[PDB]
PDB file of C-alpha atoms and ligand atoms in Angstrom:
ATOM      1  CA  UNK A   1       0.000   0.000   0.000  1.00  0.00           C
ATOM      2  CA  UNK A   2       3.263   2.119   0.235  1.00  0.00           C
ATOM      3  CA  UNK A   3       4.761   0.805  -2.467  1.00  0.00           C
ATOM      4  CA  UNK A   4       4.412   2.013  -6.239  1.00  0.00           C
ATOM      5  CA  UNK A   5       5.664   2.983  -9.493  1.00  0.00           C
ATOM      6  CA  UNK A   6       6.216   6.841  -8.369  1.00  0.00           C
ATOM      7  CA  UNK A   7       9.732   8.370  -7.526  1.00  0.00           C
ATOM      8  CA  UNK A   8       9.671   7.924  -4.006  1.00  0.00           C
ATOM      9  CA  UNK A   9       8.005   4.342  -3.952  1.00  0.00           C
ATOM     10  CA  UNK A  10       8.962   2.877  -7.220  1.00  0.00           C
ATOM     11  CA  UNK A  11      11.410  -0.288  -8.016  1.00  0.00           C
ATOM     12  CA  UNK A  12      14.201   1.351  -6.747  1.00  0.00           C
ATOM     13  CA  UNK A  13      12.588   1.407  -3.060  1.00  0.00           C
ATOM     14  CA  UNK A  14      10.642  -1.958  -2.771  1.00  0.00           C
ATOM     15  CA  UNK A  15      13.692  -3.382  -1.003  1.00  0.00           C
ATOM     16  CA  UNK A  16      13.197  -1.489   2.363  1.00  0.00           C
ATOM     17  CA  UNK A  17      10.011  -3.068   2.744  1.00  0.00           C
ATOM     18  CA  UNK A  18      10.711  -6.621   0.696  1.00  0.00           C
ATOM     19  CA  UNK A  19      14.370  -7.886   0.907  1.00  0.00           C
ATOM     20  CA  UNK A  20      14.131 -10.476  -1.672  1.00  0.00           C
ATOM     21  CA  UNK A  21      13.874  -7.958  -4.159  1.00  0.00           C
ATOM     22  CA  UNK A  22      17.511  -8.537  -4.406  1.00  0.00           C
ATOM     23  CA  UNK A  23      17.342 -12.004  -4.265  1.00  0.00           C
ATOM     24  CA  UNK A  24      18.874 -14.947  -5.973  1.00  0.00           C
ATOM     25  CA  UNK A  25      15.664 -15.105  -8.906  1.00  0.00           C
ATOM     26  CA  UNK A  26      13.913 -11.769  -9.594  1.00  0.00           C
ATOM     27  CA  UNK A  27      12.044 -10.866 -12.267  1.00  0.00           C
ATOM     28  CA  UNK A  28      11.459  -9.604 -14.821  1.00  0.00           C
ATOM     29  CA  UNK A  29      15.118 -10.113 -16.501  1.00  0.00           C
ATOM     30  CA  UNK A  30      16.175  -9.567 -19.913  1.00  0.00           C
ATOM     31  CA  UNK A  31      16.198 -11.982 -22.357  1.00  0.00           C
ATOM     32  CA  UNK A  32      19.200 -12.297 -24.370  1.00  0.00           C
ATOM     33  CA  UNK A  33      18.253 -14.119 -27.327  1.00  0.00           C
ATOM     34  CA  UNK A  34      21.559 -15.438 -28.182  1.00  0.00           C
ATOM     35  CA  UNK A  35      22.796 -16.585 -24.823  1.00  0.00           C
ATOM     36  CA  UNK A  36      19.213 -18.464 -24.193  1.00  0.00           C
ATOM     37  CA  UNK A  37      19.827 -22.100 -24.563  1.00  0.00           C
ATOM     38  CA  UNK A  38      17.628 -24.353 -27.073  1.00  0.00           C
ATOM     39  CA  UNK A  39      15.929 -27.582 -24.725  1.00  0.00           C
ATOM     40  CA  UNK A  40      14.728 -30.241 -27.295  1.00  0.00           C
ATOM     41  CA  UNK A  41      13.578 -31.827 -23.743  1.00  0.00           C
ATOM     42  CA  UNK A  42      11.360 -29.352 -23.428  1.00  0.00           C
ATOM     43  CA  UNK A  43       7.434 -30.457 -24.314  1.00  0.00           C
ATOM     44  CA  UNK A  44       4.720 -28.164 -26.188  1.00  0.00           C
ATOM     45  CA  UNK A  45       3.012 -26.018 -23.930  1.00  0.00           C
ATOM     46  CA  UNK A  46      -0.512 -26.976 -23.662  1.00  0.00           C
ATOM     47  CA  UNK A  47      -3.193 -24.503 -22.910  1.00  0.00           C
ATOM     48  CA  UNK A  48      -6.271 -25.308 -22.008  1.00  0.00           C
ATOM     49  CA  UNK A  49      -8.675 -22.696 -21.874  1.00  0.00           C
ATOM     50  CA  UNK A  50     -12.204 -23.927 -23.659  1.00  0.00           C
ATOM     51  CA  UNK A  51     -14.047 -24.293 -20.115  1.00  0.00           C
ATOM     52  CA  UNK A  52     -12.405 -20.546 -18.888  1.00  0.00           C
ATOM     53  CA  UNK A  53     -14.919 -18.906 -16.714  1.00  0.00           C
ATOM     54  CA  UNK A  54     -14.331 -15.257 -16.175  1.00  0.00           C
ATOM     55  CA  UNK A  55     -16.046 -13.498 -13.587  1.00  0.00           C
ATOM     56  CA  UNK A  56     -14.890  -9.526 -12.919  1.00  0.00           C
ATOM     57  CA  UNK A  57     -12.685  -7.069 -13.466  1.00  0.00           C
ATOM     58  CA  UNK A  58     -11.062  -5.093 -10.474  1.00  0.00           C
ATOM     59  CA  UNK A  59      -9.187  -2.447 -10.862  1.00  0.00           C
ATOM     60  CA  UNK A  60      -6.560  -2.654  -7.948  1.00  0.00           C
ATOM     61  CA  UNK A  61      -4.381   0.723  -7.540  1.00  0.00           C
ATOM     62  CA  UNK A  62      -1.334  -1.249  -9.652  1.00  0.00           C
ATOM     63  CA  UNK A  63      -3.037  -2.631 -12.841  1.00  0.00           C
ATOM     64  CA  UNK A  64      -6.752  -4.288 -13.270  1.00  0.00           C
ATOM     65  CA  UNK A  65      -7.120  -7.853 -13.378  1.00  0.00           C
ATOM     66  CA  UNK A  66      -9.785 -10.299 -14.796  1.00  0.00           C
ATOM     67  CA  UNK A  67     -10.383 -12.706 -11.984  1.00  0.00           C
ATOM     68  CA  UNK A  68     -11.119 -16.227 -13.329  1.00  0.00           C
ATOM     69  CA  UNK A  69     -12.868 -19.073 -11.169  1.00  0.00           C
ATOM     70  CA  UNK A  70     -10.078 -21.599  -9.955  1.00  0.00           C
ATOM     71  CA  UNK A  71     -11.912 -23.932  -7.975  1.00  0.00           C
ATOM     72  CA  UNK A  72     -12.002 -26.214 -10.215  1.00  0.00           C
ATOM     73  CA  UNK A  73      -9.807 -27.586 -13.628  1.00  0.00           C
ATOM     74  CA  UNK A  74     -11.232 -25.133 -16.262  1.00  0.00           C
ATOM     75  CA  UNK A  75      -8.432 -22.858 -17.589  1.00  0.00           C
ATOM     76  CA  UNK A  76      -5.246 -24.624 -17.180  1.00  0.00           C
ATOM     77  CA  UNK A  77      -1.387 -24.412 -18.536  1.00  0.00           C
ATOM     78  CA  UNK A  78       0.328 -27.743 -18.603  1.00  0.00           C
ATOM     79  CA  UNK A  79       3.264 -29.261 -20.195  1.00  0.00           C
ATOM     80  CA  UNK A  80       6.666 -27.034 -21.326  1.00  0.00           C
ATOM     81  CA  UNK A  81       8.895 -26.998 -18.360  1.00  0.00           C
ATOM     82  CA  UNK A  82       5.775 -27.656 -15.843  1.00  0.00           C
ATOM     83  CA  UNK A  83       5.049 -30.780 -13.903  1.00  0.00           C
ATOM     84  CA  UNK A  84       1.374 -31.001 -13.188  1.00  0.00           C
ATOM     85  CA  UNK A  85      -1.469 -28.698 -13.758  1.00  0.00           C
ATOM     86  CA  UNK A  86      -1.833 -24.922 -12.993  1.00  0.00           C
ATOM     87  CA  UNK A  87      -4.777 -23.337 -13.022  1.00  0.00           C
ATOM     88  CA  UNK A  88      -5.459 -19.733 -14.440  1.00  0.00           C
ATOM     89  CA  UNK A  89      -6.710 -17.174 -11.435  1.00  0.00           C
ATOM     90  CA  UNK A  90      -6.253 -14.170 -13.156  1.00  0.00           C
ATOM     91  CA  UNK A  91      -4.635 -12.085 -15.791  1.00  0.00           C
ATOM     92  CA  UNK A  92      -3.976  -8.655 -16.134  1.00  0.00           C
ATOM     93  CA  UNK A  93      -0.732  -6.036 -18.129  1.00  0.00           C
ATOM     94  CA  UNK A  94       1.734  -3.898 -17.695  1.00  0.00           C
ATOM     95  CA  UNK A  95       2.344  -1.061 -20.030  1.00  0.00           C
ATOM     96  CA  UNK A  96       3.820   2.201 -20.523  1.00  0.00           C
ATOM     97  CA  UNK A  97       3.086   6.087 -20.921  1.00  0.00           C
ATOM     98  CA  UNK A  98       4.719   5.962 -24.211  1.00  0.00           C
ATOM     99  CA  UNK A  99       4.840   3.139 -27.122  1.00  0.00           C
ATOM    100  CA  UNK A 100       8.405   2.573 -26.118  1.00  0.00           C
ATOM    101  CA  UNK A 101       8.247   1.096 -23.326  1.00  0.00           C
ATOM    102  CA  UNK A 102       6.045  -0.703 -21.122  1.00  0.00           C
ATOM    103  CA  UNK A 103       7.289  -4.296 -20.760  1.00  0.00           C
ATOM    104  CA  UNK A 104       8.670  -5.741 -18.223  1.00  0.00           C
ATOM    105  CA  UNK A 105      10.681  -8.555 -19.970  1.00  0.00           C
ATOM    106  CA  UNK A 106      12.710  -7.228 -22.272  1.00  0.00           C
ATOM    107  CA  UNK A 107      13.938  -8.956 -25.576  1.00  0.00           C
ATOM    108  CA  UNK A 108      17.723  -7.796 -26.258  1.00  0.00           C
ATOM    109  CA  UNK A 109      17.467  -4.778 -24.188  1.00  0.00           C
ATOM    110  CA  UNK A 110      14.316  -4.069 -26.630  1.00  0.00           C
ATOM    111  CA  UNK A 111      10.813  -2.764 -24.731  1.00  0.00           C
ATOM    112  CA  UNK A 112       7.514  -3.839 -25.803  1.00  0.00           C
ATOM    113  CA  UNK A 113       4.606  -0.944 -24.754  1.00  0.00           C
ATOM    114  CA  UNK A 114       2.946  -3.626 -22.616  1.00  0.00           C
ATOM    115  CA  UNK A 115       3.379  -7.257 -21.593  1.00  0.00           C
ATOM    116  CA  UNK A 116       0.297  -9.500 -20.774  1.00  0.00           C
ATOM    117  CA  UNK A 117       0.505 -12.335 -17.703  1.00  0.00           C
ATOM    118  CA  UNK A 118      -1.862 -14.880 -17.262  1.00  0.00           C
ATOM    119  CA  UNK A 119      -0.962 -16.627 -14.045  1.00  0.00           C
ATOM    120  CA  UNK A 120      -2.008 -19.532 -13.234  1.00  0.00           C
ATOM    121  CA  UNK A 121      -1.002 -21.607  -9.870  1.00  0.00           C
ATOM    122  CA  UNK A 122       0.174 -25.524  -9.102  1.00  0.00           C
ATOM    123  CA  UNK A 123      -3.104 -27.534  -7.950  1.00  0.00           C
ATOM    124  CA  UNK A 124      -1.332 -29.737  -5.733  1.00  0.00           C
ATOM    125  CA  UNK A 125      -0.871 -26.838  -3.735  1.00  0.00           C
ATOM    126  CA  UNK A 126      -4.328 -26.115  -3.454  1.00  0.00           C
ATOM    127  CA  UNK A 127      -4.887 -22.697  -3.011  1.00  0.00           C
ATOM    128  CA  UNK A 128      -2.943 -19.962  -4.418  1.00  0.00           C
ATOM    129  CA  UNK A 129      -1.910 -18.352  -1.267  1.00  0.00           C
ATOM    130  CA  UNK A 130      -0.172 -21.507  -0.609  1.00  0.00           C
ATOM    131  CA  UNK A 131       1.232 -21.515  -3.920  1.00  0.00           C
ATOM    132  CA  UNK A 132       2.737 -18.453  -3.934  1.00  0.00           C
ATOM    133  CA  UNK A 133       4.899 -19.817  -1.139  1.00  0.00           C
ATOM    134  CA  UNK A 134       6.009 -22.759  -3.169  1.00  0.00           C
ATOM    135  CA  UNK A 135       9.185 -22.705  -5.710  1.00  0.00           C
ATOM    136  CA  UNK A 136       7.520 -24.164  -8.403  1.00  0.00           C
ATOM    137  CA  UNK A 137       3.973 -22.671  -7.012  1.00  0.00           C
ATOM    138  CA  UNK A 138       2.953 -20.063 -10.345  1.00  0.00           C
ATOM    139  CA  UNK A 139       3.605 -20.187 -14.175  1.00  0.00           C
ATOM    140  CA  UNK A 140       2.941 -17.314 -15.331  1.00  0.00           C
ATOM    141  CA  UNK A 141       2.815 -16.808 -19.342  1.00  0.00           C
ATOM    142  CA  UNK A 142       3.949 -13.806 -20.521  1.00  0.00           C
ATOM    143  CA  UNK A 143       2.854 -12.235 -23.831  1.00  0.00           C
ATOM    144  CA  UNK A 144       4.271  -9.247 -25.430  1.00  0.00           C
ATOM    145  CA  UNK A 145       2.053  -5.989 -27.151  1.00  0.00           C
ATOM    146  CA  UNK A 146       3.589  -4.244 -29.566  1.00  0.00           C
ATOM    147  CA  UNK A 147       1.432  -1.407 -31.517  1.00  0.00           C
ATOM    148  CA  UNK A 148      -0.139  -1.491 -34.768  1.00  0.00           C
ATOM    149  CA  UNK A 149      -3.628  -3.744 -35.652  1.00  0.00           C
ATOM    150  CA  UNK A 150      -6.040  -4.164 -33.410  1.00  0.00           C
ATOM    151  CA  UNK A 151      -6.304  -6.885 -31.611  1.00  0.00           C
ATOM    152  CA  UNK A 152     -10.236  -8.014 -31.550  1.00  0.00           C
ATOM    153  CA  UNK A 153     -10.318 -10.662 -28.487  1.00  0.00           C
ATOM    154  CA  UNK A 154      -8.956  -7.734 -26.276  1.00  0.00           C
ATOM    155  CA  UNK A 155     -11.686  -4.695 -27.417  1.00  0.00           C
ATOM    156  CA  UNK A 156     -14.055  -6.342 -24.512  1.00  0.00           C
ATOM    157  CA  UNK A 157     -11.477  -6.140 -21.761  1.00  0.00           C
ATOM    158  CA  UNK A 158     -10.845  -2.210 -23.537  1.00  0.00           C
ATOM    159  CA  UNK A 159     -14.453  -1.218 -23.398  1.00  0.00           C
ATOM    160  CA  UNK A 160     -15.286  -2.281 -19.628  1.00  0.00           C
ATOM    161  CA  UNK A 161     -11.917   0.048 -18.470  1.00  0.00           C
ATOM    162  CA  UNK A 162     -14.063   3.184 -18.097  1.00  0.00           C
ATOM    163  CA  UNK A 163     -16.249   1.349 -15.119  1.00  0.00           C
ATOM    164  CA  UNK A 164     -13.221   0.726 -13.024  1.00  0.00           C
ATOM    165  CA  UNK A 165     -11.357   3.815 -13.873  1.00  0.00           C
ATOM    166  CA  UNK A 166     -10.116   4.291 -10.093  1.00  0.00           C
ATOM    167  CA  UNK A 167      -8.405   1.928  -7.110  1.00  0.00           C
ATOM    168  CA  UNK A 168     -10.579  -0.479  -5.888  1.00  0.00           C
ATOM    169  CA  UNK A 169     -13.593  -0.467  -8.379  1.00  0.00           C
ATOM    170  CA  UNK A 170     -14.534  -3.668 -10.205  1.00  0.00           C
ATOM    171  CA  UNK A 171     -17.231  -4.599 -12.132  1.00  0.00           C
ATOM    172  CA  UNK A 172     -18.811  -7.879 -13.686  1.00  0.00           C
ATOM    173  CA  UNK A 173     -16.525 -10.065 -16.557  1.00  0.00           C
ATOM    174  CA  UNK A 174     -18.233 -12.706 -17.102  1.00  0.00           C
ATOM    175  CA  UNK A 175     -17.658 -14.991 -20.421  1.00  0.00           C
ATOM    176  CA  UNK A 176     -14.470 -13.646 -21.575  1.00  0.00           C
ATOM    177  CA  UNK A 177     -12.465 -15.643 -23.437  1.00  0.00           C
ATOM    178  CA  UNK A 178      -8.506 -15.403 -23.231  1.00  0.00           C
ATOM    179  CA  UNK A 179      -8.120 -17.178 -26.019  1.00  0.00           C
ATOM    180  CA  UNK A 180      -8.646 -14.175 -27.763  1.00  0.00           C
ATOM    181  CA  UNK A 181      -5.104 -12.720 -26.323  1.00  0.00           C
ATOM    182  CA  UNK A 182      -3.060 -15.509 -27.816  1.00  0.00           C
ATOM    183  CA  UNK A 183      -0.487 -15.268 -30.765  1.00  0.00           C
ATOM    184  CA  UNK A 184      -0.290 -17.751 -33.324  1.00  0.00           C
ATOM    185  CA  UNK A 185       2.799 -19.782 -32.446  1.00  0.00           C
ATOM    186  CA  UNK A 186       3.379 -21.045 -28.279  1.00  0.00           C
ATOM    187  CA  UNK A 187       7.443 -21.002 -28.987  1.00  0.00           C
ATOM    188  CA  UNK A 188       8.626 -19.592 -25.646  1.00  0.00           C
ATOM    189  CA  UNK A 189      11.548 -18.683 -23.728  1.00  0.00           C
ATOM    190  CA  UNK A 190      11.289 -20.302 -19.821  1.00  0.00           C
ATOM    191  CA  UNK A 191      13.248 -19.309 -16.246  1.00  0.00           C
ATOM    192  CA  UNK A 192      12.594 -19.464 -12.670  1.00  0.00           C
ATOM    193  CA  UNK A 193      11.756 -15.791 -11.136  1.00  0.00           C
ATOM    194  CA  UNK A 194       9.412 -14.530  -8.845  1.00  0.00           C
ATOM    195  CA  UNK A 195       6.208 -12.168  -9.187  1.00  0.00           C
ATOM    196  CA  UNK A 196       7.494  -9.045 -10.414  1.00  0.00           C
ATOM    197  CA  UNK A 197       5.178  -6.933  -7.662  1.00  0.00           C
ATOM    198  CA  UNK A 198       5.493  -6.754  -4.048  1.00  0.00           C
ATOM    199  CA  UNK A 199       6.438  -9.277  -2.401  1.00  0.00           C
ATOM    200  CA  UNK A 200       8.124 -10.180  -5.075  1.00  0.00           C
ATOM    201  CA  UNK A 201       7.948 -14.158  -4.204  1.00  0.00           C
ATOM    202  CA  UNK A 202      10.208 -16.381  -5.682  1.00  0.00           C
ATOM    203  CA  UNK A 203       7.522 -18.681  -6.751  1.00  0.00           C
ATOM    204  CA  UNK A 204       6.981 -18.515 -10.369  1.00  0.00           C
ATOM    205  CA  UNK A 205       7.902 -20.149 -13.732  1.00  0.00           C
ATOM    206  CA  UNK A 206       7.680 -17.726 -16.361  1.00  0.00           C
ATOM    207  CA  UNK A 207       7.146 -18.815 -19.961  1.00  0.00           C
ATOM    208  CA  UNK A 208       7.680 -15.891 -22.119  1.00  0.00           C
ATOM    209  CA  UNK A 209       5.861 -16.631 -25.897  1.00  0.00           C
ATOM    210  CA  UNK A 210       8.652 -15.061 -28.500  1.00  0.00           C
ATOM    211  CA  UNK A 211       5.609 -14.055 -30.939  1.00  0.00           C
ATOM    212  CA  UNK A 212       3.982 -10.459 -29.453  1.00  0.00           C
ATOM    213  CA  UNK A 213       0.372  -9.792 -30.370  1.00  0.00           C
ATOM    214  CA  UNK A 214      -0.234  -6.287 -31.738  1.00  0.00           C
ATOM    215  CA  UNK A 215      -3.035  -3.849 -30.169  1.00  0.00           C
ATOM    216  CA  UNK A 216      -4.211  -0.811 -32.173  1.00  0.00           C
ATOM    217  CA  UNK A 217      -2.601   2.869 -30.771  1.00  0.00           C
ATOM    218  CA  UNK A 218      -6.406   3.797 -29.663  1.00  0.00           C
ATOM    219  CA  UNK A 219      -6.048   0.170 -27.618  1.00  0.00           C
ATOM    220  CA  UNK A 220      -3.110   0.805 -25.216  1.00  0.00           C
ATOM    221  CA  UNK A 221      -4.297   4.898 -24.910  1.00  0.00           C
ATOM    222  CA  UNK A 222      -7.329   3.493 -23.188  1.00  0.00           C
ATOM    223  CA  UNK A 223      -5.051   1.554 -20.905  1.00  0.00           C
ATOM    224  CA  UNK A 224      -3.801   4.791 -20.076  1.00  0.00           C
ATOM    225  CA  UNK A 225      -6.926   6.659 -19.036  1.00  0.00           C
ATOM    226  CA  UNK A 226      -6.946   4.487 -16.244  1.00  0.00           C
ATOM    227  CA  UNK A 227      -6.304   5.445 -12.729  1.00  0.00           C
ATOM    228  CA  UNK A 228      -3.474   4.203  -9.622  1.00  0.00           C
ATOM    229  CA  UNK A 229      -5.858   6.516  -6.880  1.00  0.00           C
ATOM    230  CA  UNK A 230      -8.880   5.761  -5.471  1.00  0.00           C
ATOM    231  CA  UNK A 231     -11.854   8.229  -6.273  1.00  0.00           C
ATOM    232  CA  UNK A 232     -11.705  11.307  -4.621  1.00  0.00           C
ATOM    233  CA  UNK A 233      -7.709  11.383  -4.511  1.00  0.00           C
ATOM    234  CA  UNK A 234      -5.937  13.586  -6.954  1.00  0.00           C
ATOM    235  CA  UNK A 235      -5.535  11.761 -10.320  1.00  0.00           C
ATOM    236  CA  UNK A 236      -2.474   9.903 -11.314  1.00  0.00           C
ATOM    237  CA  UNK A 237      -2.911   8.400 -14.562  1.00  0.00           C
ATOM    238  CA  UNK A 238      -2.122   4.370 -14.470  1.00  0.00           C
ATOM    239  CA  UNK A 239       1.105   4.458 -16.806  1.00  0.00           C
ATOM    240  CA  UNK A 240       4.772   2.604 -16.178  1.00  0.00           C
ATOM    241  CA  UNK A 241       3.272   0.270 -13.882  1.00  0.00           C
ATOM    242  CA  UNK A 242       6.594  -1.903 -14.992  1.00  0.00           C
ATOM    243  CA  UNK A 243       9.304  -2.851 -12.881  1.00  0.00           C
ATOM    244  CA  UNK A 244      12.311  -2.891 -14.868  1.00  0.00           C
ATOM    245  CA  UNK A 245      14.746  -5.868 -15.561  1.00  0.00           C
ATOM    246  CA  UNK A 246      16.310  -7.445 -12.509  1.00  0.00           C
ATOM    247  CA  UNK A 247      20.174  -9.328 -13.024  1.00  0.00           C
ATOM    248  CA  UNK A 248      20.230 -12.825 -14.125  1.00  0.00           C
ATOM    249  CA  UNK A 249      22.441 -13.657 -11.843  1.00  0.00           C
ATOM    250  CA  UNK A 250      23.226 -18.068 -11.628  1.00  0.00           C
ATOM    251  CA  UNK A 251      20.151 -18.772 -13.909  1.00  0.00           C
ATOM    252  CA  UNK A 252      20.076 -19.871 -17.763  1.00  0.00           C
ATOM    253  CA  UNK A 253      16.878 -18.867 -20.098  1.00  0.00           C
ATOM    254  CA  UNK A 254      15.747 -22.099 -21.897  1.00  0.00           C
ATOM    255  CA  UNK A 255      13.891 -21.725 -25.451  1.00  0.00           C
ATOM    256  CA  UNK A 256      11.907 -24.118 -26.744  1.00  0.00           C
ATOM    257  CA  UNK A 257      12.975 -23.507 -30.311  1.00  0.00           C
ATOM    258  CA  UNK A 258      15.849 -22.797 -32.055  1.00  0.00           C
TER     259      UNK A 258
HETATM  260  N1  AYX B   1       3.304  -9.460 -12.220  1.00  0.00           N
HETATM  261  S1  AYX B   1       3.236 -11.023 -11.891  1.00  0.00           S
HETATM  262  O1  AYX B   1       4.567 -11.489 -11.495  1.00  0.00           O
HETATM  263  O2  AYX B   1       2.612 -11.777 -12.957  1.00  0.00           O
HETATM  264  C1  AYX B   1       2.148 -11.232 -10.511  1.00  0.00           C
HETATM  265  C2  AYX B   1       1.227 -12.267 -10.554  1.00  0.00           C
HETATM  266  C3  AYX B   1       0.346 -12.441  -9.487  1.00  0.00           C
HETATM  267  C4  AYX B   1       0.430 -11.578  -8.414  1.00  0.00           C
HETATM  268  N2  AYX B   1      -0.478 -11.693  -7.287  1.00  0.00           N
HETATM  269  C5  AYX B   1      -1.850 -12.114  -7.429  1.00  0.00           C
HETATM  270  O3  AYX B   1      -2.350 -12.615  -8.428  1.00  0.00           O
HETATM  271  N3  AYX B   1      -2.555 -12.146  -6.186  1.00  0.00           N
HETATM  272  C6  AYX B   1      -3.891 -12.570  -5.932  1.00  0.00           C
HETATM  273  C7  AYX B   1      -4.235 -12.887  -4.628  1.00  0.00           C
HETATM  274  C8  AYX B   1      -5.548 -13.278  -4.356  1.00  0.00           C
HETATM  275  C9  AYX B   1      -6.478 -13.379  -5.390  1.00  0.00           C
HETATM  276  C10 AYX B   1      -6.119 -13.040  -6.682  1.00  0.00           C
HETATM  277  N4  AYX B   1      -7.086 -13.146  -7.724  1.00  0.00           N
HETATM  278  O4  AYX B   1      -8.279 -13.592  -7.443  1.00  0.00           O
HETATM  279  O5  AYX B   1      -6.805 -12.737  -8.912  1.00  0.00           O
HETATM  280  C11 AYX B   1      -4.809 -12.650  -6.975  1.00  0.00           C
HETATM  281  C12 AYX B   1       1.343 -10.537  -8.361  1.00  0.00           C
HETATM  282  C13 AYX B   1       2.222 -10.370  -9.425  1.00  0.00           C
HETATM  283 ZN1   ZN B   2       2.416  -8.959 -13.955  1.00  0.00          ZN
END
């Protein structure tokens, strides 16, 4: 509730209050393309999303997620470097106040002007509050936007932003489909990291697709419109909600082509 994306409670200060933001496998890191390492033991991902049921949209002071039901096996990631199923719970972006730069990952020191997660958490941990406190607890797929078309399965998730302009208004999702969000090919890049927010767990596979999707320039300016303060606080626009890339330090990126 202290921390932020401002100048006095931004990346830069998130250690005070959580230590392991210098830790041993922060995220998000930047993907060298060259140095990642080709795994031909690595199996196709497998997303499962037909049964998805969406259910609201909240924003929450740091981005605005669409909540999913996870009670039961309907919107799960399986296979690539994962053993078992993980359920999706919610997905939301990161993006910037300008078209350069948003991302979080970054590609060869290249931004993307946003970067989608869908996060999804290991069922044999059976809650995600006990997942998050697991090493292999969340996979979390990350998808880069770049602008230029439209994208078509995102304009719903666009339209409902102006009912939860400000902190801590949500409103009903229902019957959203995320397969909407998805590029064409699941080639991916795959580490071990941690949620790239406070507290900044070190819980989480990412799998990083190497295609982007493109949203239109009227897409991401809605994005912008949006709001970090509650209603009635002065207005700060939600914009570079991104924490930067953290060192690699003893990991390797794995890609699952060559
Ligand atoms: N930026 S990220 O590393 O992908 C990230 C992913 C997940 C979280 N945390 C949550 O999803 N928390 C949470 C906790 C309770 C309920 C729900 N939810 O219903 O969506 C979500 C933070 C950062
Ligand atoms: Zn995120």
């Amino acid at each position: 509730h202290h921390w932020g994306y401002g100048k006095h409670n931004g990346p830069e200060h998130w250690h005070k209050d959580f230590p392991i933001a210098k830790g041993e496998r922060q995220s998000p890191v930047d993907i060298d393309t060259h140095t990642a390492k080709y795994d031909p033991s690595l199996k196709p991902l497998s997303v499962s999303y037909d049964q998805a049921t969406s259910l609201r949209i909240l924003n929450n002071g740091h981005a605005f997620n669409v909540e999913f039901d996870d009670s039961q096996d309907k919107a799960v990631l399986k296979g690539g470097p994962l053993d078992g199923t993980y359920r999706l719970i919610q997905f939301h972006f990161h993006w910037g106040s300008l078209d350069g730069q948003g991302s979080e990952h970054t590609v060869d020191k290249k931004k993307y002007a946003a970067e989608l997660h869908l996060v999804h958490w290991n069922t044999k941990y059976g809650d995600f509050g006990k997942a998050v406190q697991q090493p292999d607890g969340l996979a979390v797929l990350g998808i880069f936007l770049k602008v230029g078309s439209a994208k078509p399965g995102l304009q719903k998730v666009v339209d409902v932003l102006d009912s939860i302009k400000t902190k801590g208004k949500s409103a009903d999702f229902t019957n959203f489909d995320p397969r909407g969000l998805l590029p064409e090919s699941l080639d991916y890049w795959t580490y071990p990291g941690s949620l790239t927010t406070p507290p900044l767990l070190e819980c989480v596979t990412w799998i990083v697709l190497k295609e982007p999707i493109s949203v239109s320039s009227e897409q991401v300016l809605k994005f912008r419109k949006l709001n970090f303060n509650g209603e009635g606080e002065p207005e700060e626009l939600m914009v570079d909600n991104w924490r930067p890339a953290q060192p690699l330090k003893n990991r390797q990126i794995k890609a699952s082509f060559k």
